Symmetry: D2
Subunit: 400 residues, 4 copies
Amino acid sequence: LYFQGSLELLKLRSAECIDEAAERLGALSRAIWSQPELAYEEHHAHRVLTHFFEREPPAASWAVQPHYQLPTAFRAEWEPPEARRPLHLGFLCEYDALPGIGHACGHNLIAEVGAAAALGVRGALEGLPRPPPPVKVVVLGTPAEEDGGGKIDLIEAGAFTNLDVVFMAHPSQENAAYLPDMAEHDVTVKYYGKASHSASYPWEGLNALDAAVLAYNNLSVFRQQMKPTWRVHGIIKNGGVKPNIIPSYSELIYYFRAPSMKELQVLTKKAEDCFRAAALASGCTVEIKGGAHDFYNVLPNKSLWKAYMENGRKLGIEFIGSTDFGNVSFVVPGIHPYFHIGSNALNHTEQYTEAAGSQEAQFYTLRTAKALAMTALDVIFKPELLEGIREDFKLKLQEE
Amino acid sequence: LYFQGSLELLKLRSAECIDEAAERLGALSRAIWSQPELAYEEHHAHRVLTHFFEREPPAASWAVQPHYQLPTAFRAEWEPPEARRPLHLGFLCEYDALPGIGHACGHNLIAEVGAAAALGVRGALEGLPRPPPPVKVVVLGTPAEEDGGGKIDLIEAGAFTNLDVVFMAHPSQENAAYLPDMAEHDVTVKYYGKASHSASYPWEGLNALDAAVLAYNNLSVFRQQMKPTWRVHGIIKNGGVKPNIIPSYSELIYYFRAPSMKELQVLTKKAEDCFRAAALASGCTVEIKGGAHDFYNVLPNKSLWKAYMENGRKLGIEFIGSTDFGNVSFVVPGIHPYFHIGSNALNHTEQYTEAAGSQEAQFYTLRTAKALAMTALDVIFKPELLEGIREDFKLKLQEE
Amino acid sequence: LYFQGSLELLKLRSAECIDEAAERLGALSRAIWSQPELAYEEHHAHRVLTHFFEREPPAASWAVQPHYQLPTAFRAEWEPPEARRPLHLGFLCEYDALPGIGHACGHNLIAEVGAAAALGVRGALEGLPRPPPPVKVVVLGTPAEEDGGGKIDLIEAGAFTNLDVVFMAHPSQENAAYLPDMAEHDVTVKYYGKASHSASYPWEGLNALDAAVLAYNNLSVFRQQMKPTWRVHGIIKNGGVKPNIIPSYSELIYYFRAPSMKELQVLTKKAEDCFRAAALASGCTVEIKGGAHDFYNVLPNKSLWKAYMENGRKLGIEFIGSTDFGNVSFVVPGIHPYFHIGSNALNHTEQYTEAAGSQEAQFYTLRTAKALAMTALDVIFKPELLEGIREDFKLKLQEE
Amino acid sequence: LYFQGSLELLKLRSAECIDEAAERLGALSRAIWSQPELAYEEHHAHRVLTHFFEREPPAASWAVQPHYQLPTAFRAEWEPPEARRPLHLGFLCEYDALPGIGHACGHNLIAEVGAAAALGVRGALEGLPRPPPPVKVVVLGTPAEEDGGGKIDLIEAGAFTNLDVVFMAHPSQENAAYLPDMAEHDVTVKYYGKASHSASYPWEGLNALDAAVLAYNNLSVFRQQMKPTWRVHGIIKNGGVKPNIIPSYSELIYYFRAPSMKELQVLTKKAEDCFRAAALASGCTVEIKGGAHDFYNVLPNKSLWKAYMENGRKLGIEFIGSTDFGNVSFVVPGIHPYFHIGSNALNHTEQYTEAAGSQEAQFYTLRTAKALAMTALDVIFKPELLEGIREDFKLKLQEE
Ligand SMILES: NCCC[C@H](N)C(=O)O
Ligand SMILES: NCCC[C@H](N)C(=O)O
Ligand SMILES: NCCC[C@H](N)C(=O)O
Ligand SMILES: NCCC[C@H](N)C(=O)O
Ligand SMILES: [Zn+2]
Ligand SMILES: [Zn+2]
Ligand SMILES: [Zn+2]
Ligand SMILES: [Zn+2]
Ligand SMILES: [Zn+2]
Ligand SMILES: [Zn+2]
Ligand SMILES: [Zn+2]
Ligand SMILES: [Zn+2]
């Protein structure tokens, strides 16, 4: 309330700190939005974001590690200069675009919203007269969300093993503190047959294009027995070269989605039967190559969920795919809220690139960053909440 | 020529003996044609044919064994009453019809043409003043040509192991001393899945109807890589019962045809891959049940071929599927000529049943029986021809 | 409360009236359960249910019309003998079983629960000292729910045009005052080709079995672009007779489900394109015959929903396909709650027939009948609720 | 015989003239074989062949038109310098290779064999003491046989309207004066659908890849009802780009072959039904684009056939796809014999390129050129043969 040093006043300070930084946070968004870069190629965005934290006053108050494991990844850390285990709070920035249509998923706003929340938390804790509790604010630039999974590469380097809670936000069509993101497995299927002159001796050949079509048929009829939450999508990248030669090679690219890892394994095995059946029927051999990284479904955290919604409702927010944050949510208690930005456009469309760079989206982006920062303050000053967060994280890991 | 006892006069006598028997041979044809019976159910035809040979004068001059191994099969034998290894000459009678459309393959004429040729040979040898060479005229009633393969059942009982040459003729659209009949393998494919209520939990079921459709697709694309002489035809006998229940059972009936046994084995294995692939893709188990008897392609005999054509050309005959005679032709040197009967209709059509029972067909039937009988006389009185027949039979068995 | 003639005491009386009738209501359930009858063949169940209402004391106090439009349908009506528009309250009894597995949907309990609720309402209103408000209690026996749609035949005869509210309940695995039942369209697809002897001239034929398989393929790949709430299930009833004859006839039986009538029309047209495409590709002609009756989705009524849940919570009930009640819910404000009966078995399984006839199911059946009867009392004595029910019924009809 | 100026001596002179030119004709073959060029890109081969006829002594005795209508086509003409309608005898040179594997159809030998036959005819007629009959020897370089059909472009320019007979020869595995070459129709099929994000709203898209697969299925099952002489081969050139986007475009390339133009039209319409059915089933639109030129089957000429075989048998030759020569054979009486070149390799394989350039192939190439030249001499000095050739050409055009 009106008590000197209360949590409410701390939350107000973080909101005011975000407002004071609205101009340079908007410029940060525009710099990434105006120069769209693809997965692992976000060299400009990496330069803009490291420069941002390096320039925050006082200079070098943020400890910035550019090229953190990946060339376009970075890490920035701040903690109160006091010295009396410190709580580690992570905030993630995404910044890879989509081919042809630019930042059609609003990832420029994700970078902004993660940087704004971190600025808000530090600014709130700097205003604390008495020494603030030991806490480290960690910002992780995670490239290549749309392809590859940079968070997973960072997990593989141990970048998340010391975080207690992780925050980030994603723009979409509605405001929700959690949405069901599915597990994903990607696969490329290559069939190898035996070429033959179809005009002369076509019976001496093994038709790899037949294999591709029969695989497509195997999966298609399988859709009737798929769980309604399952998803299967694929294309025929290579279906032959010339009609006068029986195709001896074909290539399919597929991905499978299911709400749990156990269900994804079942769906993947069923699909493998479909691909291998097409080889048996056509006489070809088959190479089934899975993606470098399976993407996990996002583990919800009930305690973190309720705390964020309470903060958002105070801010005026009215509440109601797959991502590599799912892998993070399995190793660190996190929340991945989606927020509306003033547009009816759908993510991954040209019109969303327009909304993502719009002036209108700035208000909604900074508002959700305020909710994130205020929720981080909750975890810091409510040890009971941190316990419930960890208890919910433990029980959810058992259910898998 | 005009020499007392020459082969030409013997051939004339067989033709005159067939003419004298034209009335009762026609009645024999009509008795089978007017009472069509299916495979293994030819009880009337068996009664008519055994009575025919029993009644040939002098009574019991033909040694008749009714119910010879099969209930509707029979064997009739005659030899000159002299006594001085005897040459064994076989003539086959078929008499099973087709369901619904009667004797649409003219099998009533096959019975007639085999009985007429045997009568002609005996009548010719009875006119020989000097004792005739030792020869046994064997008539074999072979039921169930259109389904089952009664010749194969008779082969299994050793009925053909003592024959030196075998004769029969088949009515069709053109006159040919030999036509390419293919090897055949029949199969019934049953898929077993797991039933489930498609309205509630269809993902808990394994769709046996999917298996049937995927098998159909596997074979269909395979047709492009089939040898142009190969044939594949099949139906879906059972494709489900009710739409509200995921089908847990499906049944397909197929047959495969190829010009050689080696090619039939390759085609059958390729098809087995197609059927088993559908099980793998759908998760069902599969039971592939082959027919009781594989049907062999008909082995040609060049020496017997040329001799029959020379006889037919003298008679006015102008020369240009699968059958269990193919299995016979593998174990006994035989010929299976096709002959025109005065109609443009195709075998296995309703209009062929009309031609088969027509008065017009009698002339052509008795004419081809004359050619058969005259060719049997060639083998009897030309040991050089019997040698060439056996030499051609040996060399053809090596080529398989 | 404890006020002479309050609504609470009226609701208690209906519950006590149902308890007093527990024995004969159980016998009613067992009589239908032990003698399972299929759609439109429920002659025994019709006899049991008409006798039940005819025998309720005083004799002929229920006005019973046997053979009401359908031979196995009936109508029973009671109203207070006072005379001062009367409110018309309908209760539906179902009683058709499923082939082979008996009453695997618990329809014997539906008949019981509808009769019990009607008895409870009458018994409550008979205890009213002052003349009770004008109300007619209508019981409608609706045969053939699992096939045909007897409610629709009754709608076609105008049987529902004078009802203000309609009640019924359905046993399942969980307690819910409303569940999403989908709209359904049934279709039989017949393809007509041209027969030909596949061994001779298969190119002279038009393969109706190809048409069936190609239709199956057309729909199968279409599943990827179906809305996740859509359902398509079908079988190949006729896929050919003999493999030696190119099939000139094939038959498929399908049904389509969608949450709204507008979506069902879109899905049905898409499927019609798939069926007609198979005719074009194969050269066959196609006859697409829709079912006699399309089944509507069930229209929810919010006011009736909340009132029933409040009654059920007081009774201890803890709350969390397609039916011809959907067509009723479009013309009369109704509720179709599902209730647990003490078993984990799924509807339309053999083990559900066991639960449906179990002694355990009686307690849950009579408890839900109490909730229905108490909700009918709400509508009678709360004109504001009847207004909200009609307002919710109007607004829902606009949304379609 | 041994008569001064007989036809036999003229035929000997043509054979000796070909032998004397064996060295430079071999160099002609090697120049084309060592520098393989594709359809319409045979600039080197055009330069070599025009230089060849320009250099034949006396210089400019051959009237040579380079770049005759097509850039790589040419025309060369010689006639006896006497002057007294002249018979026009055409000889065709092909010289386009195949991509990657060079002259795997032996087209370098076709150019050689056409030039050698023309040289042989001129040399024979130059030795005639008395003025020779009026005859024009026309050589036509016809590029782009393997793709496009340069003969058809030349037909369209009227290049064949004044020829009375046309000769050429093609190397293969066996010697035959005529082989059944089929009519061909080529087609590219493009499907246009509606893109949609399969992860979000895949039901808002129309799957053009489905269309491609359904077309493949439509044609595949159609193979069972195809005439055994029909051929259908095609590939999926474009089957989608990324799996996350429902494909809105697909592309198939097919070709169809049948022995007659009437049968090709029937097969093409049946295939068009298959392609259009896939559009209807998937909701896409379809563009069916046929090739620039349909290739005709080769019309046989019996009189020319027998004359060439009689010449070849005297030379030691023992006798036993689709091409644009079929279109020529429809407008000019021609023969297109195939000849063995000393190898077991199949045309359009890497090992045939080895045989085509081999020293061994030269003997067989010059031998068949001798047969061609000797047959041209037959037509010149046998007006009865020219009549029978034209009579056979007329009667064959009626039968189509
Ligand atoms: N990388 C984000 C999740 C995976 C998704 N299918 C994609 O590759 O975009
Ligand atoms: N039995 C005669 C040969 C086999 C043939 N497919 C049939 O069953 O008629
Ligand atoms: N009749 C109840 C709804 C329709 C359902 N598919 C059935 O026929 O059972
Ligand atoms: N041009 C020769 C005939 C046509 C053949 N399919 C090809 O394109 O090679
Ligand atoms: Zn995205
Ligand atoms: Zn994103
Ligand atoms: Zn037959
Ligand atoms: Zn037959
Ligand atoms: Zn039911
Ligand atoms: Zn039910
Ligand atoms: Zn070629
Ligand atoms: Zn060629």
